[model samples]
Target: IEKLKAALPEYAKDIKLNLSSITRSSVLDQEQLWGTLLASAAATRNPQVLADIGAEATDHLSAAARHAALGAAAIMGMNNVFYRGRGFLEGRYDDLRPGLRMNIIANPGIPKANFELWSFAVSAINGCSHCLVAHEHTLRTVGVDREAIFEALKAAAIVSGVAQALATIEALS
Candidate 1:
């Protein structure tokens, strides 16, 4: 992490700010940042996610620059929630239903605010209160309007319904 920070000073600095808070909160140790970066990089399969530690690289590549990084981070966080939710869902005996599978299939491609909204929807469907709250907070931070959130959930419902129906048809074959 230090080497990456040195290579890309700006992003490293922002990550350090959060790391300091994480340390002070006792939520994570100093080495946790490296773990977070490594896990995030692996999940996204985007080497560029850690190619630099500065916002400058994003500036050179993305139209929204640093905001894009923020969005990426939020999406990564959502992935963590999904991982946990999947575990819980799978653990439930005799609960193999199509709705949850549908939600999972429709999860990707929810860019920016919609991404967070989809996360919240999944949390709601899975009864993951903590995840729902966290995603709601993130959505607020990203300036997502309440109406838009509601609308996104509606879309999530539609997609989830379609996925379930399709899964049922596949099962019939």
Candidate 2:
């Protein structure tokens, strides 16, 4: 993490902002709360960030909750691809079942807020605008601030950017 952050100054505006913005976190303070952000990072498929955050998350989250966080990423990965591609079509097929096995989302050893938080992050990382909007709506219905949602989505961008920066450095090396 330090190495990538160090490399940020040498990159362009977008990359620099993306990598540095990890510092802009407002909600991800606790060691325990990291599961949501880390899972969102993993959903972005960034190898280094995943390892960095996962190592830290190992102690904070229970085995079940940790897996659920991972599950959030895995499921969102499929969902974003499936749904984003479907964006090309109309709502004619909206009634179809997802048929996905996402039962882990039902509180898997963590609070419902935690699960929804993690789910929202993963969806943001996946670029599923639909999922992002809906999840933010759900969170707001429960009194989650729009500010918190923006901050979390910013956190997701940092995670994704770090991965891209890492890959760039590796390729350049």
Candidate 3:
């Protein structure tokens, strides 16, 4: 925690809650603070992502700042999938435009939540911090608990690993 603060002081300074705060109450915690900060960063840096995530309607500076702050606070404790893939990954949502039915058929029992999680996970893998924060907030609205969200993120990590392995195998072949 101190390391994070030292590395990203600008971001780290805004964090009001500590690990002890989290332990003391059910309402606030370290994870939640981190999520909020992550969301806030995206909202502040990139308004488009916030708009897409439905945090705000417009792209004005006021909206951007407010949404970013809200988003960062909302994203705390979210799984990497919500913060990383669905939020950050481009082109995947474009695929969803065809129709939910077709998308489900191709993926098999993949609900909106799962899709969102996967998208966020992929986005995180690609290092899109903005996307990570946006999706983290979205997932929370859909009732996904932190533990479940992380589990989905784990699955995404596995998928990423497998994809890398297969690519390597193909290259060797």
Candidate 4:
């Protein structure tokens, strides 16, 4: 996380501050917090964000949790587009199966609720209402409170913002 702060350009002070605040959450546990971080960073698909944030995430996440976080990002990356694309087409695609391999979602080798929370964070970043609803329902069903879910979304927002801020600096360069 410090690596992320250090990488931020001076013009992105707000993003740096927000990133700092989001990482210190009261609602999410260690697994939930770090998993959300990893999932959100991966969702951004920014190499620097992944390099810095992913490095910190490894120290906090278990092998299973880290793998599940990556899985959440990977599967949602596809599902967000497929499901969101369906919404644009407006109905014809509803009957068609995704037919995409999502075996990781079934058995992520971590607690299901944790995986779902991570998935929800990524879905929020991807702006896929379909995936968001699906993951949120699963999270609620498994007894994850809205507060925890909300915290994950906050993390996702800051992480995504940081990625864009970094990109903007690079673009201006």
Candidate 5:
């Protein structure tokens, strides 16, 4: 209600509506929904968007879920670049070890399924197909349904567009 909608451009009224509806997803529970939104906002790398969404999440996420959301974004930030670089090489570098630390993926505080789902949403924003495939596979392994996954992606898409619009408006100022 603060910066989130206050800064919305006139062109983004639909985005505002979508944001409200998506936050109350019937498919994902509160933890999963907020985690996906915060992680995607972090992945968007827009401070205003992250803060706006994060403020809304302050009351919704438990400490564990909040930590996992930030953890997913942090780890995926590195993993996405490394894996996408490998894909850009067309498998030439497939054998190389990432060597980057990613222990959070194993013990992300929240349920593993929830963490993987949030990671998948962030990976989608970062445009890392490898990360997406890996996360999506883990999601299925943990019994996460496709509908829930789709719901997460929808939030991510909306968050990404809102981030871009907010940034654009800031620049216009």
Candidate 6:
């Protein structure tokens, strides 16, 4: 999230927490931090932001965390679109067999709750309410509290905002 604050101090904090504070949590150790940051960055799809800070975000991930992060982004690329469109359908997609191969979701690099937490975070950034509900529900069921989920969402917000700001500047340039 320092990446967000880099251009604008106003970018990193929300009403409930700050990026630095969130980074220090036990639930979100260094490895998980990299996983979340990279996943959020990937979901944001800002090539400029990715180019600028991608390496930093990826430097210490466990191989599984790395795969999970990339998988979360790639899957959300499909999910957000399908689910957002499915949202428009208002339930007609019941049988649509997303057949899109979500095998990675089954084998997320971290614990199931952690993986779902990451997916939930990116889903929050993607603005796909359906995915948020699904992921959030799983997290809650698996014992992740609202605070942790909130942190994940905030991570998404920071990454998304930074990506947007950088992309906006790039476009202007």
Error of 4 at 99 (Å): 2.0
Per-residue lDDT tens digits of candidate 2, residues 42-129?
8867677688768767766678778777877887778777777666579766778867776666545666665666778888877788
Clashes of each: 2, 0, 23, 0, 0, 0
Better of 2 and 6 by lDDT: 6
lDDT digits (tens) for residues 1-173 of candidate 3: 22222322232232313322322334322333323323433423333322332332233224433333343333322433343455566746635542222233123232345444544554555556866666667779887677756654443343333334333443556
Compute each candidate's TM-score over C-alphas: 0.36, 0.80, 0.35, 0.93, 0.94, 0.80
Which candidate number has the best lDDT? 4
Better of 3 and 6 by TM-score: 6
Put down candidate 6 lDDT per residue, 1-173, tens digits, no spaces: 45445554344335124445555566665765667778888888887656545666656777777777778888887888888887899688778787777877887756887688778878888789989999999989998888878878877887676676667656766
Candidate 4, residue 84: how far the Cα is off, in Å = 1.1
Compute the lDDT for candidate 1: 0.43
Better of 1 and 4 by TM-score: 4
Compared to the true structure, candidate 1 yields what TM-score?
0.36
Ranking by lDDT: 4, 5, 6, 2, 1, 3
- lDDT of each candidate versus the true structure: 0.43, 0.69, 0.40, 0.89, 0.88, 0.73
Model 5 sits at a Cα RMSD from the real structure of 1.4
Mind sharing the TM-score for model 4?
0.93
The C-alpha RMSD of each candidate to the native structure, in angstroms, is: 17.6, 2.9, 17.3, 1.4, 1.4, 3.3
User: Which of the two candidates, 2 or 4, achieves a greater lDDT against the reference?
Assistant: 4
| Residue 14 C-alpha lDDT in model 2 | 76
Q: Which pairs of residues clash in candidate 4, taking residues 3 or more apart in a chain or in different chains?
A: none
- As for candidate 5, its clashing pairs are none
**Residue range 1-173, candidate 1, lDDT tens digits:** 23332333342354444433432443322222222222233233334433432332332333332333334445545555655666667567445553333232233333445445545655554445666677788888988776655543443333233333333443555
lDDT of 2: 0.69
